[PDB]
Scaffold this active site. Structure first.
Site, PDB file in Angstrom:
ATOM      1  N   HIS A   1      -7.797  88.011  -4.747  1.00 57.31           N
ATOM      2  CA  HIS A   1      -6.664  87.424  -5.457  1.00 57.31           C
ATOM      3  C   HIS A   1      -6.891  85.954  -5.815  1.00 57.31           C
ATOM      4  CE1 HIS A   1      -4.853  85.882  -1.415  1.00 57.31           C
ATOM      5  NE2 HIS A   1      -6.056  86.379  -1.176  1.00 57.31           N
TER       6      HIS A   1
ATOM      7  N   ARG B   1     -15.329  92.096   7.879  1.00 61.83           N
ATOM      8  CA  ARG B   1     -14.706  90.825   8.286  1.00 61.83           C
ATOM      9  C   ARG B   1     -14.653  90.873   9.801  1.00 61.83           C
ATOM     10  NH1 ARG B   1      -9.377  89.723   5.111  1.00 61.83           N
ATOM     11  NH2 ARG B   1      -9.558  87.783   6.340  1.00 61.83           N
TER      12      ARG B   1
ATOM     13  N   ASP C   1      -0.589  92.780   1.061  1.00 60.61           N
ATOM     14  CA  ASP C   1      -0.702  92.505   2.480  1.00 60.61           C
ATOM     15  C   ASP C   1       0.570  92.790   3.257  1.00 60.61           C
ATOM     16  OD1 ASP C   1      -3.330  91.766   2.096  1.00 60.61           O
ATOM     17  OD2 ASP C   1      -2.999  89.662   2.589  1.00 60.61           O
TER      18      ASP C   1
ATOM     19  N   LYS D   1       2.979  84.730   2.501  1.00 58.28           N
ATOM     20  CA  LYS D   1       2.321  85.876   3.129  1.00 58.28           C
ATOM     21  C   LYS D   1       2.160  85.671   4.644  1.00 58.28           C
ATOM     22  CE  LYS D   1      -2.213  86.188   2.947  1.00 58.28           C
ATOM     23  NZ  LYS D   1      -3.253  85.335   3.595  1.00 58.28           N
TER      24      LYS D   1
ATOM     25  N   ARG E   1     -16.414  83.450  -0.271  1.00 58.40           N
ATOM     26  CA  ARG E   1     -15.932  82.575  -1.326  1.00 58.40           C
ATOM     27  C   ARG E   1     -16.863  81.439  -1.725  1.00 58.40           C
ATOM     28  NH1 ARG E   1      -9.581  82.812   0.799  1.00 58.40           N
ATOM     29  NH2 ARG E   1      -8.922  84.378  -0.740  1.00 58.40           N
TER      30      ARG E   1
ATOM     31  N   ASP F   1      -7.520  77.904   2.147  1.00 57.75           N
ATOM     32  CA  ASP F   1      -7.108  78.784   1.052  1.00 57.75           C
ATOM     33  C   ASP F   1      -6.760  77.990  -0.202  1.00 57.75           C
ATOM     34  OD1 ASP F   1      -5.278  81.305   3.019  1.00 57.75           O
ATOM     35  OD2 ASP F   1      -7.400  80.713   3.023  1.00 57.75           O
TER      36      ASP F   1
ATOM     37  N   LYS G   1      -2.602  91.080  -3.947  1.00 55.83           N
ATOM     38  CA  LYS G   1      -2.768  90.964  -2.500  1.00 55.83           C
ATOM     39  C   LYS G   1      -1.681  90.030  -1.961  1.00 55.83           C
ATOM     40  CE  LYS G   1      -6.217  90.569   1.137  1.00 55.83           C
ATOM     41  NZ  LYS G   1      -5.675  89.534   2.106  1.00 55.83           N
TER      42      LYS G   1
HETATM   43  O1  LIG Z   1      -2.944  83.059  10.037  1.00 57.48           O
HETATM   44  C1  LIG Z   1      -2.795  83.135   8.787  1.00 57.48           C
HETATM   45  O2  LIG Z   1      -1.737  83.347   8.225  1.00 57.48           O
HETATM   46  C2  LIG Z   1      -3.988  82.839   7.932  1.00 57.48           C
HETATM   47  C3  LIG Z   1      -5.023  82.060   8.477  1.00 57.48           C
HETATM   48  C4  LIG Z   1      -6.271  81.756   7.683  1.00 57.48           C
HETATM   49  O3  LIG Z   1      -7.394  82.550   8.188  1.00 57.48           O
HETATM   50  C5  LIG Z   1      -6.076  81.952   6.178  1.00 57.48           C
HETATM   51  O4  LIG Z   1      -7.351  81.821   5.526  1.00 57.48           O
HETATM   52  C6  LIG Z   1      -5.432  83.305   5.903  1.00 57.48           C
HETATM   53  O5  LIG Z   1      -5.295  83.470   4.498  1.00 57.48           O
HETATM   54  C7  LIG Z   1      -4.050  83.337   6.582  1.00 57.48           C
HETATM   55  O1  LIG Z   2      -5.154  84.447   1.562  1.00 53.89           O
HETATM   56  C1  LIG Z   2      -6.356  84.001   1.562  1.00 53.89           C
HETATM   57  O2  LIG Z   2      -6.788  83.192   0.808  1.00 53.89           O
HETATM   58  C2  LIG Z   2      -7.323  84.506   2.602  1.00 53.89           C
HETATM   59  N1  LIG Z   2      -6.675  85.520   3.436  1.00 53.89           N
HETATM   60  C3  LIG Z   2      -7.412  86.194   4.465  1.00 53.89           C
HETATM   61  P1  LIG Z   2      -6.421  87.319   5.283  1.00 53.89           P
HETATM   62  O3  LIG Z   2      -4.988  86.933   5.073  1.00 53.89           O
HETATM   63  O4  LIG Z   2      -6.719  88.645   4.706  1.00 53.89           O
HETATM   64  O5  LIG Z   2      -6.861  87.242   6.732  1.00 53.89           O
END
Ligand SMILES: O=C(O)C1=C[C@@H](O)[C@@H](O)[C@H](O)C1
Ligand SMILES: O=C(O)C[NH2+]CP(=O)(O)O
Length: 427
Positions: A385, A124, A49, A22, A344, A313, A411
């Site tokens: 998720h 957020r 996403d 992702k 969380r 994560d 997600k």
């Molecule tokens: O920059 C990113 O891809 C991310 C950073 C963190 O905040 C992670 O917690 C989030 O799920 C993804």
């Molecule tokens: O993937 C996760 O565990 C947390 N993601 C937060 P986001 O990607 O929405 O900023």
């Protein structure tokens, strides 16, 4: 509401070809959209996403095509900043990797765009990114609560001296880094205090370089960016499999394997969550590393006490795996769990106690003492998720578990349960 009940899983063993990352997917799509030329992305993740990012790109006028399984995407780069007027609303679900990067990117030039999302996204934080963008010249308005989406972006980010707080979210810096190169003036991004979750900044810089841009990283405390640059299509680009999604399968083997191999990521991966494998190893599991795989084989499982800010994560997976470990597990330095898909720390503590664990919910840590035996529970998932995926591991015991709103896994991993089933064995 919807629910899924998982039957006890006697053993896990097998191979899973991972869905795309992702984090990489949404960065690659935005950079491909900004770039000159046609980018072909393969192994792209099809999940909520990414779909919100794709829909935003469509709304902004970007042309692209998707393969039947939506994992191959041919994007026609815009050759510069994206634009729309009339306060065009882009609905971004609860995708932070769409909201934060677009909040910054759409500040380039003139624009009149509104970014919003699901209720939780309006809770957020994004104020520290907005503060930084404004220092660089952007005009941004909070349409509801100060410091949170929705935002009305009217452009104006030209560059200059920008300070940003990176103590809670690395995404604010990530958003600034991807945007700054296209600003007319040079930008010096100064981190106010400490920076949390550094590996995601490395992912951002890695992707930027793939798209032709490099910057000066001064020990992660200051980033010097030259303005007037352009992103360039890398041609064909392979999106790494998702290391966070991999955590559930590797942990499943650590608990009930067997050997589970995940493909699509390996020792050379740019994702920080591959370090989750190191934690399983510390707990007593055996890990094998390959060029394009990581596998985990059951050994034993002992509790651990460690800082998890480098893998926030995937760290959630250790919280449920702890139910099967010998001793009390403590996961520390995870305050940011509170500002993600749900709080969380509160959610994990609440649901873990339902299956029998004694849990101390610290302000920025969680201490878990497993019960002698788990009991059945109907697990609430908080539109998160990972709550659904983490608690699926409860079924690697003698008790079934019911997971509410199982589709919330979409997600980042729509096919999660079918994949867990693929490695679940009866004998
Ligand atoms: O920059 C990113 O891809 C991310 C950073 C963190 O905040 C992670 O917690 C989030 O799920 C993804
Ligand atoms: O993937 C996760 O565990 C947390 N993601 C937060 P986001 O990607 O929405 O900023």
């Amino acid at each position: 509401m919807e629910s899924l009940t998982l039957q006890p899983i006697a053993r896990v063993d097998g191979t899973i070809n991972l869905p795309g990352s992702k984090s990489v997917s949404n960065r690659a799509l935005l950079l491909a959209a900004l770039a000159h030329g046609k980018t072909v992305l393969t192994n792209l993740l099809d999940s909520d996403d990414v779909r919100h990012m794709l829909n935003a790109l469509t709304a902004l006028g970007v042309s692209y095509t998707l393969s039947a399984d939506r994992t191959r995407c041919e994007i026609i780069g815009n050759g510069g900043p994206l634009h729309a007027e009339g306060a065009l609303e882009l609905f971004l679900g609860n995708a932070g990797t769409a909201m934060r990067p677009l909040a910054a990117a759409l500040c380039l030039g003139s624009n009149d765009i509104v970014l919003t999302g699901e209720p939780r996204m309006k809770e957020r934080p994004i104020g520290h990114l907005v503060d930084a963008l404004r220092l660089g010249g952007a005009k941004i308005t909070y349409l509801e609560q100060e410091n949170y989406p929705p935002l009305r972006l009217q452009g104006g980010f030209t560059g200059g001296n920008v300070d940003v707080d990176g103590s809670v979210s690395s995404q604010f810096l990530t958003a600034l880094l991807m945007t700054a190169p296209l600003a007319p003036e040079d930008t010096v991004i100064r981190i106010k205090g400490d920076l949390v979750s550094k590996p995601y900044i490395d992912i951002t810089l890695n992707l930027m370089k793939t798209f032709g841009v490099e910057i000066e990283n001064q020990h992660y405390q200051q980033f010097v960016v030259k303005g007037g640059q352009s992103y360039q299509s890398p041609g064909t680009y392979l999106v790494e499999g998702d290391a966070s999604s991999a955590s559930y399968f590797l942990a499943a083997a650590a608990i009930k394997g067997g050997t589970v191999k995940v493909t699509g990521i390996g020792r050379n991966s740019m994702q920080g969550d591959i370090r989750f494998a190191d934690v399983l190893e510390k707990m007593g599991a055996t890990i094998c590393w390959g060029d394009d795989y990581i596998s985990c084989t059951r050994g034993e499982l002992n509790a651990i006490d460690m800082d998890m800010n480098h893998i926030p994560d995937a760290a959630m997976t250790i919280a449920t795996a702890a139910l099967f470990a010998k001793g009390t597990t403590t996961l520390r330095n995870i305050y940011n769990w509170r500002v993600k898909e749900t709080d969380r720390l509160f959610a994990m503590a609440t649901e873990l106690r339902k299956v029998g664990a004694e849990v101390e919910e610290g302000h920025d840590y969680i201490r878990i003492t497993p019960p002698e035996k788990l009991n059945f529970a109907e697990i609430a998932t908080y539109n998160d998720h990972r709550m659904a995926m983490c608690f699926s591991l409860v079924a690697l015991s003698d008790t079934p578990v019911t997971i509410l709103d199982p589709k919330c896994t979409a997600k980042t991993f729509p096919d999660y349960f079918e994949q867990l089933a693929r490695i679940s064995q009866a004998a």
